[PDB]
C-alpha cells in the first residue's frame, strides 16, 4: 500500500557540536598548532608549565599541550564540548564559563586562545573584555597567545570548501560558504548523512568579526601586556598576537 | 558575542503519529461516525457485541463503539498508534498488523475500516486483498463496513486547510493541501510549533487511490460479501460500503 | 505511475521584504505612529513641513505623514522595498542608502526612524553613528524622532505569536518567536503559504541590540540635539526619544 | 548592524530535471548501453533503422543510436527533458507523452525503454499497458528492448551513494540512498550546492517497482511479442527483456 514520507526540522541557537568539530578537525593540524604555543610561550617563558586553553572545543590542541604544560585546563561554553574535551584529556579539567567574562581564582604560566575563537566577540570592547579576563589569569611574566581571525585586509571573499567521509553503512558529506558582511564573515556550513536509519541534513550560520591587527595589539596593551604581532607562527598573512604580562 | 543559528532536518518513512492524530481529530465528529457503524450493524445484525476497528488510529472510534460491541479490538501498523489506542481503551486489545494480509484467528460480529484508510491500497487487487482479510475475521452473517475514500467523480481538486491550537507557552498551526494525480490524491500537511524549547516544522506526504463505486462492491463480492452502498450514512456524496457475509 | 515529489531550498541574506512587510502590517496602527511623530515635531517646531522616514520600509508611515508634512523623503537598503515604497508614494523619492551613514545633501524639519528600526545597530558606537546621521539632516531647530526597540529591563522573554490570512484559492499561515540572548533579542518569523502552485515554507531569523535608555539619550547629545524621553506617546513602556538640534 | 538570515523552500510533485540527470550521468556508461540496444536489435531485425527511446530523459542514449538508427524519435513527460534532448539531437522529435498510453500515429523497426524507467509503472497491469503501447509502435517483425529495473530478488538493501563536482566558484555535492518498501524501491537524493549567490539543497524520493522477471515477460507476450530474457546483456544480474513482435 501507499507509504507516506516526512520530514521534521528544528531550529535553534547552536554551540560548539561534537561530530561537527571532529569533522571540521580532519585536515586540521592540531600538532603544528600546539607547537606553535609551546614555541612562544618557552621563548619568553622558559620554565612555563601550566597553561589554560579558552575555547578549547574537543580539548584536542590540551592534548599535545599537556606534555608540555602538565598543569592545564580548558574552559568551553559548550556543555556538550566541555563533556568530550574532559573525557579525552587526564585530570584535566575543562570549565564551562563565558570566555569574555570567567574567573578560575588561579593563574597558568600561559594563556592561549586558538583558531580565531576570539573572534566571536562583536566589537573592540567585547574584544578588550576577553583579552582581559585572559590577562587576569596571567601572573607578571605569564604569556597570553592569540590566534587572531581573519583582518578586513586579509579576509579572502570566494572560500567555498567541501568534505566527503565514506564509512561501512554511513556516509556524511560537508560543504561550507563563506561572505562579508560589513566587518563580519558569515560562515554557512552544510552537512547531508545517510545511514540505515534514514538520510538527515543539518546547517548551521555563524559570523566572527574581522579586527585589524590594531585591535589586537590594542586589546592586548589595555590588559596590561606588551604587545606582540609574530608572523613566523600561525596561519600565513595573519601570525599570532602575544602579549607578556607586566609589572 | 556572536552566538551561531542552526537546523537539523531528519528524513523517513512514516505511519500514524499521536499528535497529528490528535490535530486533525479536532473538528472531527467521532460520535457521528461511531453512531454510523453501530446503526448499520444492528439492522443487519441486532445481537452483534463483538467488532474489529482496522487501521484504528488513536483509538477514539473504539472508545466510542465498545459501549454497544464490549468484546472489541483493534489493528493498527504503527507502532506509536497501537500504544496509544491501547492505553486509551480498557481491555481491548490493539494488534500491530498489516491491513492488507493479518489474521487474528477468532471472528466478530462486525469488521470496519474508518475515515477512508481502505485507500492505502494502491489498486483494485490490494483493495480486494483487505477486504478479502477483513471478510475472513466474520462469520456468516457478520457485517463489514468500509467508510470509502473519495471516487475519481467525488474527488475535489483545490482543497486547503488550516487550523491553529494557541496553548499556555506553546502555539501550533497547521496548513494542508491535496490534489489529483492520476487515480491518485496526494495530500501535503504542513506544522509549524513553537514553544520555550525553539520552533519546528514537521512535513508529511501521503497518497491515497481514488476507487470508484465499483471497484470496492467488488472487493466486497470477491470477499464473499453481499454488497450494499448506503448514502444515508457517512458523508454526502460518499456514503458507505457495506457487506454481509454469504453461507 | 509512481511520481516523484522534491523540494528545493534557498538560504541567504535578508533584508526587507514586500509581503512579509504587509503582513507583519496587518494589526499594526500606522496612523496611531503617524500621529506620534506629527504631535512631538509640530510641538517644537511649529511650521514643520519636511520629513524624513529613514529605514522606512512600505512606505506606509509616510503615507500618513505627507498630508502634515509635503515636502518628504524616505530612506531604505533594501532595492524591493525602496521600489514599493515609491511606488506607493508620489513624488515623494526613496533613497538606496545606509541608515548609519548615508548623505542626501539636504535637511528636513523633522527626521525619524520608527519601529525599533535603530536597533539594527550592533551596538553603542553604531547607534552613536546612526543618530548622528539623522541629526546631520536637520536645521537647528529640526526635530529628530526615533521609535526605539526595548531595553534589557523591558524586553519581555516568552513572545509567541501567529497569524492567518486565508484568501479565495491561498492561504498564508506565520508563527514568531523571540527570545533574549546577551544584550540582543533574537527573532524567528516563519511562514507557510499554499495555493494551486503548492506550498512553500519561508523562515528569517534577525536580531536586534536591547539598549537601555542612557544609549539613546547619549547618542542624542552627542549628535549635537538636546534629548528627550517622552512616555506619553510610543508603545507603554518605552516611549519614544526626540532631539531638538541645537545652535 | 545586524543581518537577517532567511530560507525558502518551495514543494511539490517531480519529473526529469536536467541538471539531476546530468549528475546522474557522470559515470553512466551511455555508450555501453546504446550498444546493448544496437546490437539485440540488429541479431533479430539486421535492416533495422528506425528507433523509438520511450521516457528518453535529457537525449543521450539517441545522440549514441542516431547513428545507426537514423530515423529517431524520443518520448518524455517531463517538458524540460523534451527541451533539452531535443536541444541535443538533430531532426530528432522528442514527444511529450506519457509512456502509459501514447500513440505517436507511426511504427518504428525497434523501440527500447532504457535504465530501469519502465518500473515507474505502479502494478503489473500498469506494466502491461506501458509495453503494449510501445508494441504498437513495432511492425510484425518489429524488436522491444526493455531494460529493466531490480526485482525483488535482485534489489540490494543498502545502497548508499554520493558524488562532488567542483568547478571554477561552485561546487555541488550529492548524496543518495534506497530502501525496499513492500514490492517497491525508494530512493532518495539530496544536493547541496553552493556558488557566489548562495547556498541552495534540493531533494527528491521517488519510487520504482520491484517486478519479478515473470511479470515482464507476461507483459511481453501479452503485448503480442514473443518474448526472451538476455543475460549477456545489460547489467549483471538483470539482463534485458526482448520482444519481437508476432504476426
Ligand atoms: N562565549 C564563549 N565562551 C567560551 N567558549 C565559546 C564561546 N563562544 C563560543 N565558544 C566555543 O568556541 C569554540 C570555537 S570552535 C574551535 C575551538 C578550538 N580553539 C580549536 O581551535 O579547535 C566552540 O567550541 C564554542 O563552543
Ligand atoms: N497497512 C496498514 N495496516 C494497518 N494500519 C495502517 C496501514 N497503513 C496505514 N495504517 C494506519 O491507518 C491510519 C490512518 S489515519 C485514521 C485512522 C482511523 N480509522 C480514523 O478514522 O481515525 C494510520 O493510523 C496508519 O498508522
Ligand atoms: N542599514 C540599513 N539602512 C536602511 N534601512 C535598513 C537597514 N537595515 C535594515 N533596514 C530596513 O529597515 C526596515 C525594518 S522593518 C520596519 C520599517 C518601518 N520603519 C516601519 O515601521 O514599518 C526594513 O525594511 C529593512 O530593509
Ligand atoms: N509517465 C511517463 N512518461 C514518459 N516519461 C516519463 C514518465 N514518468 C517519468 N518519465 C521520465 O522518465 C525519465 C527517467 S530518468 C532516465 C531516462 C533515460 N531512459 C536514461 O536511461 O537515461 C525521466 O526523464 C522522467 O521525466
Ligand atoms: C588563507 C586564507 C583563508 N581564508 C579564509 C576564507 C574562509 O572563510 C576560511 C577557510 O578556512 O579561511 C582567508 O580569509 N584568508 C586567507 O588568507
Ligand atoms: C466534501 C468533500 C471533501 N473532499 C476532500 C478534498 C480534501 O482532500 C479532503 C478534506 O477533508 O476532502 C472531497 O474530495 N470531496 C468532497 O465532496
Ligand atoms: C509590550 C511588549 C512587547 N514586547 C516584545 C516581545 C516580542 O518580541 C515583540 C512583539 O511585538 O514585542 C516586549 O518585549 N516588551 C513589552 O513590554
Ligand atoms: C548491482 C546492483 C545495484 N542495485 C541497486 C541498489 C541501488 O538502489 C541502485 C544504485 O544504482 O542499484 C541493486 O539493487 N542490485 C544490484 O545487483
Redesign the interface.
Not at 500500500?1 to 554551540?15: E, I, K, P, R
Not at 566571536?120 to 566589537?123: E, G, L, P, S
Given at each position: 500500500?501507499?507509504?507516506?514520507?516526512?520530514?521534521?526540522?528544528?531550529?535553534?541557537?547552536?554551540?560548539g557540536e561534537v561530530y561537527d568539530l571532529f569533522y571540521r578537525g580532519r585536515g586540521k593540524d592540531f600538532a603544528a598548532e600546539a607547537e606553535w604555543v609551546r614555541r612562544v610561550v618557552r621563548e619568553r617563558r622558559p620554565g612555563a608549565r601550566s597553561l589554560l586553553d579558552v575555547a578549547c572545543g574537543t580539548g584536542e590542541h590540551l592534548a599535545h599541550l599537556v606534555e608540555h604544560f602538565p598543569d592545564a585546563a580548558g574552559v568551553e561554553l559548550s556543555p556538550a564540548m566541555r563533556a568530550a574535551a574532559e573525557r579525552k584529556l587526564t585530570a584535566t579539567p575543562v570549565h564551562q564559563a563565558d570566555?569574555?567574562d570567567f574567573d578560575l581564582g588561579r593563574v597558568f604560566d600561559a594563556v592561549c586562545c586558538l583558531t580565531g575563537s576570539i573572534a566571536?566577540?562583536?566589537?573592540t570592547?567585547?574584544l578588550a573584555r576577553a583579552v582581559r579576563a585572559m590577562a587576569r589569569h596571567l601572573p607578571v611574566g605569564g604569556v597570553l597567545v592569540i590566534d587572531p581571525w581573519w583582518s578586513p585586509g586579509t579576509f579572502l571573499d570566494?572560500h567555498?570548501?567541501?568534505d566527503?567521509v565514506?564509512g561501512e553503512?554511513?556516509?556524511v558529506?560537508?560543504?561550507?560558504?563563506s561572505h562579508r558582511?560589513?566587518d563580519?564573515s558569515?560562515h554557512?556550513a552544510?552537512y547531508?548523512?545517510?545511514?540505515?536509519?534514514?538520510?538527515?541534513?543539518?546547517?548551521?550560520?555563524?559570523?566572527?568579526?574581522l579586527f585589524p591587527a590594531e585591535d589586537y595589539l590594542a586589546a592586548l596593551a589595555a590588559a596590561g601586556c606588551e604587545p606582540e604581532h609574530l608572523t613566523d607562527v600561525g596561519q600565513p598573512r595573519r601570525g599570532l598576537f602575544v602579549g607578556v604580562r607586566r609589572e
Open positions: 500500500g501507499h507509504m507516506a514520507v516526512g520530514s521534521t526540522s528544528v531550529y535553534g541557537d547552536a554551540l570566555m569574555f566571536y566577540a562583536a566589537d570592547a567585547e570566494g567555498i570548501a567541501h566527503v565514506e553503512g554511513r556516509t558529506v560537508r560543504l561550507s560558504r558582511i560589513g563580519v558569515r554557512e552544510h547531508l548523512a545517510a545511514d540505515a536509519t534514514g538520510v538527515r541534513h543539518f546547517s548551521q550560520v555563524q559570523d566572527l568579526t
